Enzyme design. Structure first.
Site, PDB file in Angstrom:
ATOM      1  N   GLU A   1      12.030   2.923   8.032  1.00 43.65           N
ATOM      2  CA  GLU A   1      11.037   2.006   7.480  1.00 43.65           C
ATOM      3  C   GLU A   1      11.381   1.562   6.060  1.00 43.65           C
ATOM      4  OE1 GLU A   1       6.225   2.476   6.545  1.00 43.65           O
ATOM      5  OE2 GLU A   1       7.537   4.228   6.726  1.00 43.65           O
TER       6      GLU A   1
ATOM      7  N   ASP B   1       0.862  -1.183   0.000  1.00 45.22           N
ATOM      8  CA  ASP B   1       0.000   0.000   0.000  1.00 45.22           C
ATOM      9  C   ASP B   1       0.898   1.232   0.000  1.00 45.22           C
ATOM     10  OD1 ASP B   1       0.379  -1.362   2.657  1.00 45.22           O
ATOM     11  OD2 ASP B   1      -0.263   0.585   3.451  1.00 45.22           O
TER      12      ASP B   1
HETATM   13  O1  LIG Z   1       5.224  -1.787   8.894  1.00 48.26           O
HETATM   14  C1  LIG Z   1       3.838  -1.998   9.009  1.00 48.26           C
HETATM   15  C2  LIG Z   1       3.209  -1.787   7.629  1.00 48.26           C
HETATM   16  C3  LIG Z   1       2.866  -0.539   7.322  1.00 48.26           C
HETATM   17  C4  LIG Z   1       2.388  -0.151   5.922  1.00 48.26           C
HETATM   18  N1  LIG Z   1       0.949  -0.409   5.782  1.00 48.26           N
HETATM   19  C5  LIG Z   1       0.179  -0.100   6.993  1.00 48.26           C
HETATM   20  C6  LIG Z   1      -0.303   1.371   7.048  1.00 48.26           C
HETATM   21  C7  LIG Z   1      -1.667   1.699   6.420  1.00 48.26           C
HETATM   22  C8  LIG Z   1      -2.212   3.037   6.931  1.00 48.26           C
HETATM   23  O2  LIG Z   1      -1.374   4.081   6.500  1.00 48.26           O
HETATM   24  C9  LIG Z   1      -2.716   0.636   6.710  1.00 48.26           C
HETATM   25  O3  LIG Z   1      -3.876   0.953   5.979  1.00 48.26           O
HETATM   26  C10 LIG Z   1      -2.157  -0.705   6.250  1.00 48.26           C
HETATM   27  O4  LIG Z   1      -3.158  -1.669   6.363  1.00 48.26           O
HETATM   28  C11 LIG Z   1      -0.986  -1.088   7.157  1.00 48.26           C
HETATM   29  O5  LIG Z   1      -0.555  -2.394   6.855  1.00 48.26           O
HETATM   30  C12 LIG Z   1       3.228  -0.932   4.899  1.00 48.26           C
HETATM   31  O6  LIG Z   1       2.829  -0.621   3.589  1.00 48.26           O
HETATM   32  C13 LIG Z   1       3.080  -2.440   5.167  1.00 48.26           C
HETATM   33  O7  LIG Z   1       3.795  -3.204   4.227  1.00 48.26           O
HETATM   34  C14 LIG Z   1       3.656  -2.769   6.542  1.00 48.26           C
HETATM   35  O8  LIG Z   1       3.284  -4.083   6.893  1.00 48.26           O
END
Ligand SMILES: OCC1=C[C@H](N[C@H]2C[C@H](CO)[C@@H](O)[C@H](O)[C@H]2O)[C@H](O)[C@@H](O)[C@@H]1O
Length: 512
Positions: free
Chosen positions: A462, A278
Site C-alpha cells: 500500500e 488520513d
Molecule cells: O486505499 C484505500 C484508502 C485507504 C486509506 N483510507 C481509508 C481507510 C480508513 C479506515 O482506516 C477510512 O476511514 C478512510 O475513509 C478510507 O479512505 C488511505 O488513507 C486512502 O488514501 C486510500 O484511498
C-alpha cells in the site's frame, strides 16, 4: 441500496462490538452483514444479553455474516514484476453481485470494479484513477469503462462519488479525480468527455454547493470564500460522529482531548478521511496528538489544484459538445481558480505551494508532497514550478522515492512513507515544467523501491518506506496492506518509462 450506516442501524450493539474489540480490525464489524432485520437482532440481543454465559462473539457469528478472513491468494511461482501486476487485476476485481441483503453496508454498483486490496473490500475514489492508469497501460479498457460507469452511477444516485461504495462512506467524497478519469477514458473512447459531461457538472455542483450565498470570510460545506473574495474548496464530511469503520479509534481520539468538543474532532477526523491523507501532520496542530486535527479549517492546495483541472476539463467537455456558453463559463472559473491558487496557496518566503490556514488567514509553511499538485495540473507559473523542483530535490527526494512530508509523526501520510499516487503526481508535474532530471529521479527511486520490495517480499504494498529501498511503509491506525491498486498502476506507467517502448522491461533495470 442500504443508505443507513451500521452505527445507526445497530445502535448499542455496534458500540458494544466495537468497544469490546471483538475483532482486531474495527472495519470488520462495520462490514458485517446482518442475517435478519436489525430490529430483530437488537431485540434478540437485548433479551439474550442478560442470559448468563452470553458470549458476544457467538451472538455476532449467529446473526452476522462476517467478511472473508482473507485466505491468502497464491500466484504461480516465478512471475516477474510486470507479470505479477498484469495477472493480479482479477485478484483485485470485485462485484456487488452477491445476493444483496437489504442491510449490507456494501452499496450495489452496476459493473465490476477494482479494489485497492486487503481490508479495502470496496471501490475507492482517488485510488481508482491510478489503478486506471495501470489498467490502461495493460489494455484493460472495459474495466476502466466499467468503473467510470460506476462512478457516474454514484454521482447520479448519491449526488457525489462516496469515499467508497459503503454506507458509512456516503457522508463524504475523496480527492476529485472523476473528470481526469473521463479524460483518460477519452483517449480510448473519443466521445467520453461529451458522454459524461452531465455527471462531471453534477460533481462540480457538489463541491461548489452554496458558493453563491457566501460573503467574504465565510464557508459552507466544501467551499470557502476568503476575505478578498477568492473562492476555494476544502475537504468536508457531512457528519460529526465517529467513523463506523474506525469507531473505537475516533472515540479514544476524542477522549484524548476532552477540552475540545468531540463533534469537532470527529468532523475533522472524517474530513481528513475525505482528503485521502488520513492521517497527517499536515492537518494537526501537534503532530503527536491526533486530537488536535483541524482539517476543516485548512484550504488544501492539492484539492484546489484538482478543482482547477475539473474546471478546465468541464470547459473542454463543453467545447467538444458545441456548448460555447458553458465552455466560456468554465474557462472563466478555471482562470479565477488559477489566480486564487497563485495568490493564496504560494509560500513565497519558502518557495513552494502550501495549504492556506483559515484561522490565521495565511498560507502555511509546511512542505508536503501536495506542493507538487499545481505543477501536476499545469496551474503553476514556470518560476514557481522551478522553485518547487528545487524544494523537491533538496528536501523531499529520498532513496526510495519522494517523501510525503518531512515530519515523522507516526501517522501514515507522513515521513518516512512514500505513496504511489504522490510519486506519480510528482514525476508528472515535474515533467510538465521541463524538470526532467528530478522527474526521472523520483521515478527511478520509487521503481527501485517497488522492485526490491517485490524481490524480497514477492508482492506490492500500500505504501513504501522511502528512507531505504525494499520495505513497505507503516504508521496510523491499521497495518500495512498488500496488493495494491495504485502501487500496481503507477508501477506499470513508470516501468514503461525507463525502457525503450519497443523493448519493454518486465523488471526494473539494474542501472540508471
Ligand atoms: O486505499 C484505500 C484508502 C485507504 C486509506 N483510507 C481509508 C481507510 C480508513 C479506515 O482506516 C477510512 O476511514 C478512510 O475513509 C478510507 O479512505 C488511505 O488513507 C486512502 O488514501 C486510500 O484511498
Amino acid at each position: 441500496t442500504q443508505t443507513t450506516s451500521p452505527d445507526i442501524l445497530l445502535g448499542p450493539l455496534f458500540n458494544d462490538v466495537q468497544s469490546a474489540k471483538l475483532f482486531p480490525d474495527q472495519k470488520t464489524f462495520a462490514d458485517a452483514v446482518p442475517k435478519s432485520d436489525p430490529l430483530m437482532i437488537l431485540a434478540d440481543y437485548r433479551m439474550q444479553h442478560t442470559q448468563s454465559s452470553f458470549d458476544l462473539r457467538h451472538f455476532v457469528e449467529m446473526n452476522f455474516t462476517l467478511p472473508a478472513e482473507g485466505e491468502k491468494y497464491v500466484p504461480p511461482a516465478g512471475q516477474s514484476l510486470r507479470e505479477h501486476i498484469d495477472d493480479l487485476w482479477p485478484v483485485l476485481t470485485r462485484t456487488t453481485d452477491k445476493a444483496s441483503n437489504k442491510w449490507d453496508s456494501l452499496l450495489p454498483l452496476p459493473k465490476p470494479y477494482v479494489v485497492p486490496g486487503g481490508r479495502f473490500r470496496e471501490v475507492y475514489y482517488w485510488d481508482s484513477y491510478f489503478t486506471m492508469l495501470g489498467l490502461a497501460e495493460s489494455d484493460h479498457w472495459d474495466k476502466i469503462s466499467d468503473m467510470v460507469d460506476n462512478f457516474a452511477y454514484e454521482i447520479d444516485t448519491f449526488g457525489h462519488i462516496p469515499n467508497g461504495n459503503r454506507s458509512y462512506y456516503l457522508s463524504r467524497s475523496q480527492p476529485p479525480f472523476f473528470s481526469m478519469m473521463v479524460e483518460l477514458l477519452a483517449t480510448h473512447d473519443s466521445d467520453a468527455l461529451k458522454k459524461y459531461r452531465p455527471q462531471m457538472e453534477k460533481e462540480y455542483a457538489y463541491w461548489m454547493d452554496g458558493v453563491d450565498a457566501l460573503q467574504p470570510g465565510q464557508a459552507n460545506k466544501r467551499v470557502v470564500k476568503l476575505d478578498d473574495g477568492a473562492i476555494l474548496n476544502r475537504y468536508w464530511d457531512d457528519r460529526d460522529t465517529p467513523r463506523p469503520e474506525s469507531w473505537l479509534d475516533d472515540v479514544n481520539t476524542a477522549k484524548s482531548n476532552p477540552n475540545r468538543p468531540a463533534t469537532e474532532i470527529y468532523r475533522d477526523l472524517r474530513s481528513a478521511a475525505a482528503s485521502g491523507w488520513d492521517f497527517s501532520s499536515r492537518w494537526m496542530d501537534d503532530p503527536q496528538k491526533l486530537g488536535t486535527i483541524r482539517t476543516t479549517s485548512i484550504v488544501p492546495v492539492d484539492l484546489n489544484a484538482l478543482m482547477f483541472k475539473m474546471e478546465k476539463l468541464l470547459a473542454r467537455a463543453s467545447q467538444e459538445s458545441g456548448d460555447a456558453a458553458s465552455a466560456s463559463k468554465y474557462e472563466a472559473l478555471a482562470t479565477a481558480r488559477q489566480k486564487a491558487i497563485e495568490s493564496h496557496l504560494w509560500n513565497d518566503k519558502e518557495g513552494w505551494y502550501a495549504d492556506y490556514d483559515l484561522k490565521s488567514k495565511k498560507v502555511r509553511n509546511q512542505l508536503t508532497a501536495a506542493a507538487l499538485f499545481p505543477l501536476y495540473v499545469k496551474a503553476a507559473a514556470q518560476d514557481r514550478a522551478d522553485k518547487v523542483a528545487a524544494a523537491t530535490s533538496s528536501r523531499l527526494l529520498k532513496p526510495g522515492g519522494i517523501a510525503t512530508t518531512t515530519v515523522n509523526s507516526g501517522q501514515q501520510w507522513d515521513a518516512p512513507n512514500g505513496w504511489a499516487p504522490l510519486q506519480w503526481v510528482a514525476a508528472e508535474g515535474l515533467q510538465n515544467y521541463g524538470q526532467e532530471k528530478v522527474s526521472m529521479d523520483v521515478t527511478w527511486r520509487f521503481l527501485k523501491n517497488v522492485q526490491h520490495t517485490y524481490d524480497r517480499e514477492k508482492k506490492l504494498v500500500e505504501k513504501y518506506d522511502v528512507s531505504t529501498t525494499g520495505t513497505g511503509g507503516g504508521g496510523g491506525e491499521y497495518p500495512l496492506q498488500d496488493g495494491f491498486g495504485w502501487s500496481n498502476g503507477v508501477t506499470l506507467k513508470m516501468l514503461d518509462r525507463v525502457c525503450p517502448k519497443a523493448k519493454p522491461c518486465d523488471s526494473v533495470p539494474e542501472n540508471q
